[PDB]
Amino acid sequence: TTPTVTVLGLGPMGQALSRALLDAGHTVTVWNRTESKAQALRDRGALSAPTPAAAIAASDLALVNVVDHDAVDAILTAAGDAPAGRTVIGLSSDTPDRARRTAKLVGNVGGRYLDGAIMTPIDTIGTRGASILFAGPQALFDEHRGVLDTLGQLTWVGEDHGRAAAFDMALLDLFWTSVGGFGHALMVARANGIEPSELMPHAHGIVGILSPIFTEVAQRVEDDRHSDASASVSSVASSVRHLIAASREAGVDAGLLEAFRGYVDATVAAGHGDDEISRIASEMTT
Amino acid sequence: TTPTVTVLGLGPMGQALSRALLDAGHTVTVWNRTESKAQALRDRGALSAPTPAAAIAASDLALVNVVDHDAVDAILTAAGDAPAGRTVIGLSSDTPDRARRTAKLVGNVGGRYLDGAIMTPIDTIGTRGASILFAGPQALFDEHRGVLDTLGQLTWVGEDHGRAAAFDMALLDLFWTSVGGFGHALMVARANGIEPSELMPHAHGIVGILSPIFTEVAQRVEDDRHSDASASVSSVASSVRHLIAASREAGVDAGLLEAFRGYVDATVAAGHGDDEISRIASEMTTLTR
Ligand SMILES: NC(=O)C1=CN([C@@H]2O[C@H](COP(=O)(O)OP(=O)(O)OC[C@H]3O[C@@H](n4cnc5c(N)ncnc54)[C@H](OP(=O)(O)O)[C@@H]3O)[C@@H](O)[C@H]2O)C=CC1
Ligand SMILES: NC(=O)C1=CN([C@@H]2O[C@H](COP(=O)(O)OP(=O)(O)OC[C@H]3O[C@@H](n4cnc5c(N)ncnc54)[C@H](OP(=O)(O)O)[C@@H]3O)[C@@H](O)[C@H]2O)C=CC1
Ligand SMILES: CCCC[C@H](CC)CO
Ligand SMILES: CCCC[C@H](CC)CO
Description:
With about 290 residues, chain A is of the alpha/beta class. In chain A, about 50% of the residues lie in helices and about 15% in strands.
């Protein structure tokens, strides 16, 4: 009558997943390599299991939320034949080939596998603000959607077990590159007498322009249409040099902007200085 | 009564500025090094002037919107004494020390100077979605704010003529780094059979999580508070390796992520793997600790 779910991995995100499943009223079994991280959840109604095999054998569905697929696959090695007749969902960020290999590891012991990628922070889990992408057999996603729906908005992205991970590689590239730019910006600003609290209203303004700019860049890349520029490659080839000089003056490394400059300069050298900045990423090939 | 404004520089942003000032009912004079670029604005009601001196002498306020301060200073040199008794606003992105240099060039010929930085794209200009930062004498900003308010939301950031540029250097760093990430992401997604149109709903979701994350990282940096992590440095140290491997496999250079990894790895090596990702940027220093 009541669905069973196991969560293996009780770092910040695995705690968040466990609390959401417990609030939904599922029977939740938890396991972590560092055992005592389960204690806060046992106080909230979770059941612990002492080993990965015992944890997976307790439920129809096991979610594995750990640092990477070396950790996932180590947990599956320890679990042995426990996945047989059960479903494993990988929720551990790694490459598409690791998601496919882990699918194979689970199938070769008689389990079924979905791969997922959580694209939102812990505060969002258990709300309509969370976004989780899934890949693998459509029917298996449909079979477990009822339990998984309490976690957030789910999107199935394809049959290929690696496809959620492929989205994750692209989306986390955008995310972490932006985070690197933000932390750099705060360092250089602070060296110029602008504390983070004073910058932040304006930094929110920059975040506010990204969606419409990205929409246009994506459309231009699909159209292969880089003409009629509103902001040219030659203009940013001038600007990025200023930004690097400012970094240098402040004693802050400029490696992200230096990499960017290399692409911009290669676009100018290729004869596309007059084109929209949608052209620059072409020069990232090699 | 009717305000007089000159725009010097008719690239895409100078055209946008000029259209917004004309749409507001101002008396707009325009000048560009390449004179043919003035025709569409003359049809909208702009006056054109043949030289920078004649352009600046036509108006109480001159906006200079060109690629950099080497171009600004070449235009103001050509204008000679035309700025005397008038106000020049630089709207051309460059360093704080170039903004201060240009301020002194204007003051040398008896003009007044504000430096400004436009922080939004051409479509926003003339709307409440635009943002322009200004630096220089507060009273001079106040004198011209009624004309300038037709371009967008305005922020005066202080009396030092370099200070709008200092914000610009920080904010464009964030912006272009993010654009570099985005263009890279599209190329790696395409190699993996995900076209830009299929990625974009999800990319908008990532943009949607940045502001609260940035607000937290800024508070932690101010507080020097990197503990009780919800996303640890050790975790991103693993993640960024995956990202770089995926770039390699797609035939795409991973320079930006490689640079980030070096900071992440240095933070782990400093014994801060369990800390929040707010700690990473410390390792960007090139100063002796
Ligand atoms: N935190 C977040 O906001 C988000 C996280 N994610 C993803 O969720 C996953 C988990 O993230 P998060 O909770 O932050 O934690 P981490 O990525 O820091 O992973 C820590 C967890 O992995 C376990 N682990 C590490 N190595 C091994 C191993 N060899 N064997 C067994 N378990 C191991 C840890 O066990 P122990 O406690 O014993 O050290 C702990 O449970 C990651 O893949 C991350 O990318 C996705 C979106 C957001
Ligand atoms: N486009 C945008 O969305 C935004 C632009 N900005 C800033 O606004 C400024 C203008 O941007 P944008 O319109 O895109 O154009 P560009 O940065 O490409 O600059 C082009 C303008 O500069 C002029 N110019 C270049 N070199 C010289 C020179 N030596 N002497 C005289 N004029 C010269 C060009 O003249 P000519 O026509 O004869 O070549 C043209 O008018 C830049 O500093 C930019 O960073 C700010 C926010 C957004
Ligand atoms: C600092 C929070 C990071 C969450 C992010 C979600 C895409 C990466 O794991
Ligand atoms: C691609 C449009 C670029 C606008 C940007 C505004 C901060 C930089 O000039």
